[PDB]
Amino acid sequence: RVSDTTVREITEWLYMEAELLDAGKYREWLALVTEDLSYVVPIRVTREREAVTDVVEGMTHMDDDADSMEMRVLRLETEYAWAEDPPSRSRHFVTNVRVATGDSEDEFKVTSNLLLYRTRGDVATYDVLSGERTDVLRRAGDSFLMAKRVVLLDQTTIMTHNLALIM
Amino acid sequence: RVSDTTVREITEWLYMEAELLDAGKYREWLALVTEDLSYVVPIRVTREREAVTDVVEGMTHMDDDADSMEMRVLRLETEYAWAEDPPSRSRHFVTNVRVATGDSEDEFKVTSNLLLYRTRGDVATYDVLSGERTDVLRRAGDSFLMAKRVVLLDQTTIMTHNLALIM
Amino acid sequence: RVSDTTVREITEWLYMEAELLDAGKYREWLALVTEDLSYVVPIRVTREREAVTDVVEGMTHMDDDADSMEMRVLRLETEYAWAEDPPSRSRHFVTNVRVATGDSEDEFKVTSNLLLYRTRGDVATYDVLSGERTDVLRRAGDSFLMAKRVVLLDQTTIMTHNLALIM
Amino acid sequence: MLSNELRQTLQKGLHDVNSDWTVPAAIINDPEVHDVERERIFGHAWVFLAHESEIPERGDYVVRYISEDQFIVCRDEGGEIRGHLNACRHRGMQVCRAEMGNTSHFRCPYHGWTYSNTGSLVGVPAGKDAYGNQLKKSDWNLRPMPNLASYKGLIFGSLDPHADSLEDYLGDLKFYLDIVLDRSDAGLQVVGAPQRWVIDANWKLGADNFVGDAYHTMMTHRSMVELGLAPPDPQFALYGEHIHTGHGHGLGIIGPPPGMPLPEFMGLPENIVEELERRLTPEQVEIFRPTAFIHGTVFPNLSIGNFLMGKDHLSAPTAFLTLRLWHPLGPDKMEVMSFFLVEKDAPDWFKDESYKSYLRTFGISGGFEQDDAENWRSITRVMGGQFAKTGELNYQMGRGVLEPDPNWTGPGEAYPLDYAEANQRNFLEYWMQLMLAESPL
Amino acid sequence: MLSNELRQTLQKGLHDVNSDWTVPAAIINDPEVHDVERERIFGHAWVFLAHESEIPERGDYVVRYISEDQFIVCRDEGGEIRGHLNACRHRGMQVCRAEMGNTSHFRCPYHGWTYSNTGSLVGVPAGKDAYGNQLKKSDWNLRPMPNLASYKGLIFGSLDPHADSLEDYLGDLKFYLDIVLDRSDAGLQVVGAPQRWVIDANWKLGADNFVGDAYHTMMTHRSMVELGLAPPDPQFALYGEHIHTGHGHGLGIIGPPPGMPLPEFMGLPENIVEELERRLTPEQVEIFRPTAFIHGTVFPNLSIGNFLMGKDHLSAPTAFLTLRLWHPLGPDKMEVMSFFLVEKDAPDWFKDESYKSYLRTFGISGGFEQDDAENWRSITRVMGGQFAKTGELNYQMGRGVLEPDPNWTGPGEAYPLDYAEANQRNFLEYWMQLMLAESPL
Amino acid sequence: MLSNELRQTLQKGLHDVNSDWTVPAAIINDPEVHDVERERIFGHAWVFLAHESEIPERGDYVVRYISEDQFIVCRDEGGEIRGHLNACRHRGMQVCRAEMGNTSHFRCPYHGWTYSNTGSLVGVPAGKDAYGNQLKKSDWNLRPMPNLASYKGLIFGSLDPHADSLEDYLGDLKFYLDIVLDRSDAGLQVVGAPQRWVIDANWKLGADNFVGDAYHTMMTHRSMVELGLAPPDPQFALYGEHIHTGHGHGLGIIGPPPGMPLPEFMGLPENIVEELERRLTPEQVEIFRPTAFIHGTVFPNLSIGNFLMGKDHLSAPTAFLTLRLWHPLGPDKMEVMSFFLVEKDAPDWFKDESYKSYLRTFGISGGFEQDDAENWRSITRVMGGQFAKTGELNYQMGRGVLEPDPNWTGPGEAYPLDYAEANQRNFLEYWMQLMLAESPL
């Protein structure tokens, strides 16, 4: 239970992370992740309230580890990643930040609400993704590394044309 | 004037409240409210800048007390609340949290910006409600209870098909 | 490096500022700005990832100083500011607040994410602006004044019909 | 002109409605249906705009609609009720961009042409310098609603200058409207303003529901049955009457069973009961005496609910009246405008109680209406499918069984129960006649 | 009826596709094209709905589409596969508002009409009190899909009661579907559910791509070529075969060059290889033996990718199968439904590896497909211009050069390389023939 | 083809515009109007695309529009100005997805076809392996703008290969364009890029306003009159001229009253004045000499504002030039593209001052233009009403009074004041003539 100076550091860490992403600083962002990274975006289906879960088992929108997340960044560093070249303009609005102690000392369970705004080109339209991110952050030196993230979107059918952006 | 540890607690309370709502934990949410609860969503109409107010007198979108809020939750606990079964996917983004002292000691005036995101079924559309919540929170044991909330939306014509969700 | 009590004060300052704007308290908001105010909203154009910048040089959506911002407010205090009479309903969602030390003592660099929600009249539609604000705040008495703001929107083609609102 | 497909569908529909007792599904959510309907229904029929109690003082106005057309409805400086197209005669700007207010004049922001709330163009900037005094102001007054009229406080308009009078249009329905509108000496008041919100459903589904449908209560409102707020008896609507009139209008009236005493006259306050016994005819009085629910639609899109209901699961019921517009926005979209009304002279305790009974059941957050909304949006979505559209809606309730009630003392075609679909059939028959009218009526 | 402009365009196109080898550009993003196509293609063709492994137990259902029409596809309480229009026979409400689940009955929320998963209407509230027992329930069962059939686990539906059988419609394509669908005794399974998301592009661009396009790899997937995930040889598709069939169907098959040994049968697990050698004909076995990529489209909008690929830039490749729907939402919009399939009896290590190889390359976040999506939305946007639409699309690859492969052992029209546009031309020729059909076929 | 309703409306309008001096209100916001207009106006007229100063170096390009059609406007490697449809000849992808930049080649991301900025197809991947060298590259260059031309730095395009030349189309308007465009040896420069934003209004409202409307200043810009930024004299526009030409084009020119000395030539810097006195004819010089405001529209949707204005309530005015496109997005939507221009050799102090005078008054955040936008969106909304659309727009300013100015020294039809609606009538007349042209002109 409790934190305080830690809440501040974790919160600032989230805002710095989001800033790197919104600046297209993917290589720098990749330095924030852990060697055992698990990064997942589940699929949801509409179900009656009675259902125990509406999260799909065995299939996912995205299920990355450190190696595949490196591939993702390496792709964006070529001259040919057409989905993001020209780059989207994006904004990661990170709100409702909750911090809890993790399963080990030096680990923290971090939950935030994300609204991701996205435009491309000169067409007068925009996309919004809304969802909850559940993270495990690990102390590393005088900062943190992300060991785990689950992005659960408030959508079943996703309302953007690809998931070319890291959330 | 002032607070500090109190700001943290109140902020954490608001994020916990939103979390319960977004998880459809209505029975748990009901335990956060006070016996003299007043929960209201006023109607607004477009008026010239000169008008003293654009808030409707005598009529409301919602005007609940503890008994009627209980009914609202009891309804959602039947097998027949069709508007929310299947449940909406919602997200309460709570930002711009302002905390002031109340009219009594042990009471606080808490004002937040709310953006409420909502999807239903598998249709590729979504609703957004935006507004300001002005609350009265009361100390109760080591936490707080909500005695009052006014949700003032930035809309006159409401842009969702019902107010089936608590804001 | 570092702040703390200062972070709180600056954050509360930003929420107080947003609140004034969303209440149409333009004259009071004008009191928050410095004599050497620079307020700018740059133009962006879609470019390949390789481009050093996508921000237009020499032309802007808005480039105000203290005198022109005064004019802006004086306009809204006439009985004839048709763009904002009747007033828009707006909400400044201010998130991801980052505070750093400025170029002088008593100055702070303040970066926040803005999502601006806007409706007008009784038509069932709404506008969203999304962007990053980078500010210089200066200590003045026991509070702050804004000396500089840059609002960089996540749009090239702007998706509202005028910039009659202060961001 | 109608496409051959739509024409044939409507012609077939006009035969089926009274033989098979079905109606083609293609009428619910279709762009061509919507476009033709805009002219053939909303350009001809009388449409509810406002209650007179919303604009009680000289200068008072509200802005209201017939489809996309926007009208200022006001009490002018001479005390007359006006309906003005909200479009400056010069370049068409809105001369009022508020939803309601009070003003003696409407001044156009574009060039400043100034209109009395009478509608008269009374001021033109540069009348001399720019127009050389050659502009005839009286030729450029705000355009009047072609037909405007009132029945017992209800302001209606029609876009058709050659429409039958409001009173002829309402016809036999007037007998029943009186029972809801004319109980008190001081009259009804709308309280505050209507709730207005958008439902992704076709407007006709709201109209269909209120014109005739008690049947839906048992399933749609099953949650409310379990909470003790809706009638628990599955046969509750047998103790009622199902009534329709010409021009697509219909209603149902439901009372309690023999072994259930409820206060007479919906338990209205004593002073109102005094007045209603003197204002209404003995025949109207006796029809109202044992009422618990009245639901109906004034064709096309004004519905009435006068219901006796608890404000929560712990409270004794009180009567409330609501009028609502199912405002057409597109084939698959509508804006509900839901008004709460109460007798001006009801005691304040009753006004508050009746307001809470309405608010927790109907309207945007009501425990009944929120499920009604979900049902209509669902039907609308799946009724946009091309295969779905080749089917029929089943209005066969009572086929081979319904006989008119020989003992009913009111006008109209009346059946001695309120589980029937005769009202919905009459509504759609009239809608289909209007859709096919190449020349009006 | 077709506009004269559209008719003439289609007629010209039907000549151009086999002479100039071009197709009019106006077919890509046009509101009339989309409206005509809805009836003429999607109201007649066989459309993929679900895989049988999605609904393995009695009572299991998914909700799927033919354009805007929504269908419950379920295994009923007798073990039969059904397809029910999801529109109650009474007033058209959805009887199932979930995307999938398990139930023995579908109960309409509006009035409580209750259907067996069989489709039979079995329960009507107030059957006596409201209907006098006159309502013949068997006349108001859920409306069946006019034509429903299965080929090797794939459930298709057609809106046309007079369609050719599924087996005739697939025709010679069946030989090749077997190679992908019928390798194992226990059969394929869809893992979890499809990824569904919206691309602002016309559906045809996805079909066009998978029916015959290996050419795009070198540029569209240049990033992946640089990372070592896509084939580095610019001539890679010369080691392959371009095949098409009647009814618009086409596929390509690509294997490794002579100086590159790869495990046979895409390196599938040993037990699966055992089974396929015994399940497929020797001719099918030998076509499959050296395969690295299979891409195709089943007209109209079901595509297949059976590809050997790394799950990241450091890994050896594994085989994965995906089926996808390009679901039409509008002239400029679609919903992709991407399914991952694997043989039920594959070892769990292989299922996980295959899943990852699919996931990082294809689907919503895949390093290949995300660029495909960007290409299709870009085309669609510019192809909405009136001038852009007077132009042609170039399908000339192979013009003056293509000769059928005399040595190919499979059915269909086959060419001995997979840089060709014959499949795309055959797809759009059938499309245009259906568009111009005043009476079916 | 036109509906009979639209045809009859236009024919009646063509008579009304010069007799009653009114125009049907149905032309502002209507889906059929927009769709016919797209072809009949934007498919035939000359439309402004870019200023040459935006693409000063070889390889420079911008992406611009004629309605939904997207064109690359560039200076190619030989220094020639080109307009290329931004749609690959293969499958129609955008070969440039940036809004502006510099490149020697456009390479399509989909299959890598590579075009010179000349437009020539210079490279095709697998030219040999896929196409067998049979693809004639010179048949598949980027499609040129059918008609491309420049007048004094302004690049226009027409979609009609048989259009009249740009010079004939501009006609007598050229005399006045010179006064704004040709003052300096080095020419004008667009500073930075246009402001681009979406207003929910029909494009014609902006064109209408700038072609001849000074009248609106007194009310629309009353706030600015009170702040001292707009002219305080209600008669200010009497000191000016209202002028129109063939092809719908028109302008107004306003100067100060006799008892108000203002610097000659809008107070332009000395070196620009020197150059203008030598670049323009004495007749053009003397018309420009006492100018304070020039406003006009190049039919269809290019407007010009050359205004003398304060950058705030405390500052002496400086002159600025703005050109703006009213880009049609839909019947009820447009994109404004607002450019600021200044003479390249103006001293820097003046460039900055002029920029600020423009920025605080016009453009997206300008204290004038923001109220203009509000007026246009308001008109548009209420003019979508079916009943509103049966009315007329009043263009009767001057009827029975206007006489051509016998003393005007420039070409065109000129009136000795700028309170008049002749220019607007001339704009709408030409618009109506084009809308009714079954064959061009």
Ligand code: FES
């Ligand atoms: S549009 Fe109203 S005064 Fe001109």
Ligand code: FES
């Ligand atoms: S709509 Fe299904 S029971 Fe009435």
Ligand code: FES
């Ligand atoms: S679409 Fe451009 S190379 Fe194929």
Ligand SMILES: [Fe+3]
């Ligand atoms: Fe109901």
Ligand SMILES: [Fe+3]
């Ligand atoms: Fe691809």
Ligand SMILES: [Fe+3]
């Ligand atoms: Fe103006």
